[PDB]
Amino acid sequence: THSHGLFKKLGIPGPTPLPFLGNILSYHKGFCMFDMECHKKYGKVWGFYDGQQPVLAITDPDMIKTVLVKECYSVFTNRRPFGPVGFMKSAISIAEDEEWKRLRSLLSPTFTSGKLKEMVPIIAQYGDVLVRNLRREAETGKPVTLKDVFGAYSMDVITSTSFGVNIDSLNNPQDPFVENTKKLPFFLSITVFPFLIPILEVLNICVFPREVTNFLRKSVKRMKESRLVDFLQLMIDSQNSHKALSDLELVAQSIIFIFAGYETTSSVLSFIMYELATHPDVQQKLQEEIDAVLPNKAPPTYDTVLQMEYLDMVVNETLRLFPIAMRLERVCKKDVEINGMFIPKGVVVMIPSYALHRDPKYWTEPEKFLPERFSKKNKDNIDPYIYTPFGSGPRNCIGMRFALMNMKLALIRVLQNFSFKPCKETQIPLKLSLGGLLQPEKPVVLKVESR
Numbered sequence: 271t272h273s274h275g276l277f278k279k280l281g282i283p284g285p286t287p288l289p290f291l292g293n294i295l296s297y298h299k300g301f302c303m304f305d306m307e308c309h310k311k312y313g314k315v316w317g318f319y320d321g322q323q324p325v326l327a328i329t330d331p332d333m334i335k336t337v338l339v340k341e342c343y344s345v346f347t348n349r350r351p352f353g354p355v356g357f358m359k360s361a362i363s364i365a366e367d368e369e370w371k372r373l374r375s376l377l378s379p380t381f382t383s384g385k386l387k388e389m390v391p392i393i394a395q396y397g398d399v400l401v402r403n404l405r406r407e408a409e410t411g412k413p414v415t416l417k418d419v420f421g422a423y424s425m426d427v428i429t430s431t432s433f434g435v436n437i438d439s440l441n442n443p444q445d446p447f448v449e450n451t452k453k454l455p456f457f458l459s460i461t462v463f464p465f466l467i468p469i470l471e472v473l474n475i476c477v478f479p480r481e482v483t484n485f486l487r488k489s490v491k492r493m494k495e496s497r498l499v500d501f502l503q504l505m506i507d508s509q510n511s512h513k514a515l516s517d518l519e520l521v522a523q524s525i526i527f528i529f530a531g532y533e534t535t536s537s538v539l540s541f542i543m544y545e546l547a548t549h550p551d552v553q554q555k556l557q558e559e560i561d562a563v564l565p566n567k568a569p570p571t572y573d574t575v576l577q578m579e580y581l582d583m584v585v586n587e588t589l590r591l592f593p594i595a596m597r598l599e600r601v602c603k604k605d606v607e608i609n610g611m612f613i614p615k616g617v618v619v620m621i622p623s624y625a626l627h628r629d630p631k632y633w634t635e636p637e638k639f640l641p642e643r644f645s646k647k648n649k650d651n652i653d654p655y656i657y658t659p660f661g662s663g664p665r666n667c668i669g670m671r672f673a674l675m676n677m678k679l680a681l682i683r684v685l686q687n688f689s690f691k692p693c694k695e696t697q698i699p700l701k702l703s704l705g706g707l708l709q710p711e712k713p714v715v716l717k718v719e720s721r
């Protein structure tokens with residue numbers, strides 16, 4: 271202290287920080303609003319302080335490529351630490367430097383296209399469960415809360431695709447697994463007081479509810495020794511030039527994978543159904559393409575999913591409006607200069623995806639939901655370091671091809687059987703949580719009708 275003079279010295283503009291808090295009072299309207307304002311207020315780069323932590327935002331595409339791709343292993347390897355995490359230190363998304371690079375290698379084959387194609391049948395099964403649970407609510411003309419029914423589905427896929435466990439979480443039952451995965455203001459006090467993280471680490475408070483972790487750690491070791499197609503197997507087969515995945519390291523990835531796909535798959539689906547209900551032509555155009563590819567409600571396959579181009583456009587455009595990461599971040603581990611700009615060690619470098627995804631300077635009518643932006647005609651003009659819903663470079667989203675496949679399979683099955691219409695209780699226009707997550711203020715509730 272006080273690092274509140276850093277950006278002023280480097281000649282980088284940005285809002286004036288208050289003592290101790292830095293700029294965090296400016297988050298009262300959410301991260302996203304704050305990044306847009308800073309983008310409009312200050313232009314291509316700017317700096318601010320999460321408490322005493324300097325954060326440098328960058329928006330130039332070349333400079334974003336340098337940070338995410340060119341200098342990843344060498345400088346910008348790690349995300350901003352948050353804690354306390356206990357043993358979750360060994361999870362790929364949290365691990366650092368050579369330990370991370372190792373975990374990436376051990377888990378990357380698990381997410382190939384070829385392995386993903388063998389998971390499609392298991393992913394296809396619970397699409398049927400989703401429809402039947404939907405129809406029970408469609409035949410009873412009662413508005414439906416999407417996060418529930420989609421979560422029930424996303425939960426169904428996860429437990430099976432990761433552990434082989436096979437539940438209808440929505441109804442079926444208090445089956446022992448649905449629950450420790452139910453625990454699926456603290457993190458702000460972390461920002462003003464990030465000097466307390468190692469305190470909680472010596473106290474062993476895990477941000478991961480210590481009981482969940484205790485359940486799965488033993489739950490995993492039950493599964494391991496009962497077997498001795500899914501992620502757990504794909505990892506068990508891996509630990510059979512890098513030290514094999516240890517037994518606790520394996521448990522921690524599974525947790526990463528359960529969360530990774532739970533609220534993301536679920537919330538993105540709910541974003542898509544929201545837009546599709548408030549844009550009936552896009553819903554119809556989509557159902558037409560689905561029926562042409564899969565006549566007679568033919569079951570989707572890996573190859574027919576990749577065949578649907580407008581399905582791809584609707585997905586991409588929703589992720590434009592609602593990039594659930596909001597920001598991409600990397601810690602500067604060494605004094606460096608990138609694209610003619612000095613960047614001191616210890617600075618956090620931030621890529622404001624949300625702000626970039628809604629920047630009029632790259633997007634005509636950036637608030638409108640317009641899938642044609644992603645037509646094979648137009649998709650070529652889109653700068654991949656502006657549109658970055660899965661990140662970029664060696665630490666991009668390892669689950670990208672799975673998530674897209676998983677969501678597309680869900681949508682196809684549901685649009686083959688139902689049309690979705692706004693209720694009087696639908697929030698139009700949907701508003702984002704002023705909080706710290708990308709979620710609607712109020713949950714998306716719609717009317718479901720059988721075709």
Ligand code: HEM
Pocket residue numbers: 338362363364374526527530531534535538589594595598599658659660661662663664665666667668669670672673674
């Ligand atoms: C719509 C769904 C998803 C979206 C939009 C998404 C987006 C993102 C983004 C933006 C990042 C940071 C990328 C970067 O820093 O360059 C990330 C990281 C990551 N995602 Fe996803 N994600 C999704 C689903 C999933 C799923 C289903 C998994 C399943 C296992 C997964 C596993 C991961 C992991 C492990 C990381 C960190 C990888 C690393 O640091 O080595 N994600 N995701």
Ligand SMILES: CC(C)(C)OC(=O)N[C@@H](CS[C@@H](Cc1ccccc1)C(=O)NCc1cccnc1)Cc1ccccc1
Pocket residue numbers: 352363364454457525526529530531534594595667706
């Ligand atoms: C304090 C706040 C909430 C701001 O930060 C966190 O704690 N969240 C990070 C910790 S990483 C790690 C954290 C996590 C595990 C379980 C529950 C909640 C968080 C993770 O892998 N989650 C998977 C994921 C989510 C989405 C896509 N792909 C993968 C999450 C993350 C990581 C990379 C990109 C975007 C988000």
